[PDB]
Write a protein that binds this ligand. Sequence first.
Ligand SMILES: *[C@H](N[C@H](C(=O)O)[C@@H](C)O)c1c(COP(=O)(O)O)cnc(C)c1O
Ligand SMILES: *[C@H](N[C@H](C(=O)O)[C@@H](C)O)c1c(COP(=O)(O)O)cnc(C)c1O
Ligand code: NA
Lengths: 410, 410
Amino acid sequence: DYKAFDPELWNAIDAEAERQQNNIELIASENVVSKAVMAAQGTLLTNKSAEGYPGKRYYGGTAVIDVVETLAIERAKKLFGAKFANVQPHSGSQANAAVYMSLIQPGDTVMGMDLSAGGHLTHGAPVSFSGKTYNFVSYNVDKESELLDYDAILAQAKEVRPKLIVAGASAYSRIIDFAKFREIADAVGAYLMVDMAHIAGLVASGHHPSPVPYAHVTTTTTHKTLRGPRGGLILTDDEDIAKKLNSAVFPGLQGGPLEHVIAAKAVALKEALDPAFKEYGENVIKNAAAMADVFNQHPDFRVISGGTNNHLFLVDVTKVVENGKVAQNVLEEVNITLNKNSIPYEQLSPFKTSGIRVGSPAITSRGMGEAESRQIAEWMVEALENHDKPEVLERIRGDVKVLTDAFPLY
Amino acid sequence: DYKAFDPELWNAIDAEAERQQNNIELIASENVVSKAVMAAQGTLLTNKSAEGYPGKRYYGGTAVIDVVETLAIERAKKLFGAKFANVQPHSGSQANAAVYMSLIQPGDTVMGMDLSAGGHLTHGAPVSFSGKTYNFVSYNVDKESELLDYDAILAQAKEVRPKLIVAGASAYSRIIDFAKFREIADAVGAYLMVDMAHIAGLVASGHHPSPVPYAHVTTTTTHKTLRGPRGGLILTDDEDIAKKLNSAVFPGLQGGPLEHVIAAKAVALKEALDPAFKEYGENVIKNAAAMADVFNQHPDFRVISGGTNNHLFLVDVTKVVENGKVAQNVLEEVNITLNKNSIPYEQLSPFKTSGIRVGSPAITSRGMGEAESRQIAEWMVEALENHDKPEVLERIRGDVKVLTDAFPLY
Ligand SMILES: *[C@H](N[C@H](C(=O)O)[C@@H](C)O)c1c(COP(=O)(O)O)cnc(C)c1O
Ligand SMILES: *[C@H](N[C@H](C(=O)O)[C@@H](C)O)c1c(COP(=O)(O)O)cnc(C)c1O
Ligand code: NA
């Protein structure tokens, strides 16, 4: 029994297992993976150096590795309807770096969604390799509707003439029109890359239209709504782009891939291919709308864009508490975790923000329904309204514990 | 029961466990990690997004994650004697990229060891981001001795004027003088980076001199001789460099770290801090030298630099078989896996090579000693000498199964 050797590490792991059980997880990026996904990434596949690609490895004794990686590739292709897939990127960020490396050059102009409106760090932040290598120029949402305006974006693309347009977001509640993004790209001879990290599970379940037919390349995390292990994935229908993508991932950016994690990708993709996964996506949408509807109806809260068609939404909380940061800290005291989040045209410090971001996937994976989602959102309103009344927080904490005890994590 | 849901995947994982058991693994980069290491990266730590650093995370619910990551940081600093450690890099390649991003700017001149004498792809290959982003100039070993010639490297550095010198290798058998590399760097006003991936377990065991007091920045994999999970690690004594490295890893190059893998790093680093790790390192050295001695004494084979003072060595096989690829294929027939390898000043195609690379770490971790290591190298000589006699290969394959049955993998 190995755990007696290292009690400080194994006690910390027991403490994190207890924190996840005793926590209402509303961070829109989080999920609860299956025991099968965890077991695959705890295998002796970690021992094998798999530099290269199936049948084209730097080393031998890789014929079983090749079967595992090919299952992950074949499942990604089947699940997303893509002719090519690369399952080696270590993360979403590495996936994105490989696509930029394949399609554009340093100094090339790129349009990505503004970081205040849900663009990722890797879509042009100045502190990211993305903004350091490439000239990123943001598009935003409409100032009043807080929706993407495909006319304003086309007009801006004709001025900017980007080599590449990046679509996809971390904090956008509405359906992104990939057919329109491809039209905008075509009108200026740009590539279109879609980073579907937040929405890949909903793409896989049928609850969000797929970018895969419209983007020259689609990137995603295997984690978030897809409910996989942490890692990246790249999809394309173009055979010449596929060759470039493969070279960019290895030996361009990475070395040996994590074949234990790729086994876990292959596990998670077979789960998403199952009819049960459609049911998962349905509850994800229902649960998110139920929570959004509680803030919509309360007069002291505005849901950004007025609602959600996906797993998440933002709330301006500044009427009820000073900033998103305070909202986060308060809800932490009743064992509800979400994050402070900038809202569109954020006016406060990015360290404070006006917003909270809420998602349904993790509570949905714990088997919660619209009733429990509505209930969680009522608790959130009540904790924020009573942020200075310690014995009200005390009481919500107790009510939360009855709910978590009722929906065991594992 | 989860295995019943996906037999194709779980059959392949069971087959890799049995393949690792029934094969003699001599790939110098491979090892057999502990049950504790595999179990740690199979935990529900994969469900927690930990963007940022301990005490300074993007999201809440990270209090326990911070204890796990801080354990990995403190155990790295203690084991390698460094004032700072970063345990987030997904891989050795991502570690190296963050160091270049910290110390130099695109187009700067870098010296790195020649890919034929053991330099990694990330040490300037033109197919790597390293050779595409930076102006790499390679240094070699001496043609006659096959040893690093620190006077010749000094004279080249004074001509080339690098901003950065990278030392460390994947096919060099002799003790590196890190004090000499830092004297060379200081003589030309360059940074010294040491990638100690191959030798890190021998630096930990006390069998190889540490680069940590001499390199501005030390990179490593947590896998290979250190016997950790697949990932990377960065060390420095310089507080200003540490702040740059941290910002380069995240948000510079990566997003969210793999905290389940970081738990596994913490497990491995505590294993390497144990007095039994010194005995491992001693057996690694003795077992590699017992294999090298078989090839040294045999007239048809030559060991690159005449032997080894670490875990690996290279053998020119071209008097017995056409090329290293042939030698790798023949040994695979008798369930011995190693890799063809370029030898210094390699004349054949890089796809063929003159050489094989042999390491001791995997067989040492299985409990094998010097008598087993010698028997293994006698079987390699016999199989290469008798490559065209199927009845000989059949017999060695049967003798190899008696040896693997006697030293079970787990
Ligand atoms: C995930 N980013 C999440 C989010 O949900 O806000 C937080 C953790 O930043 C993400 C990624 C992540 O790539 P990683 O695996 O390197 O961390 C990439 N792309 C998008 C769109 C995204 O939401
Ligand atoms: C590992 N290179 C080895 C080798 O043994 O030849 C094989 C596995 O390519 C290695 C790395 C690898 O980084 P990774 O985690 O990105 O694959 C980095 N640096 C050195 C010196 C090294 O040997
Ligand atoms: Na190592």
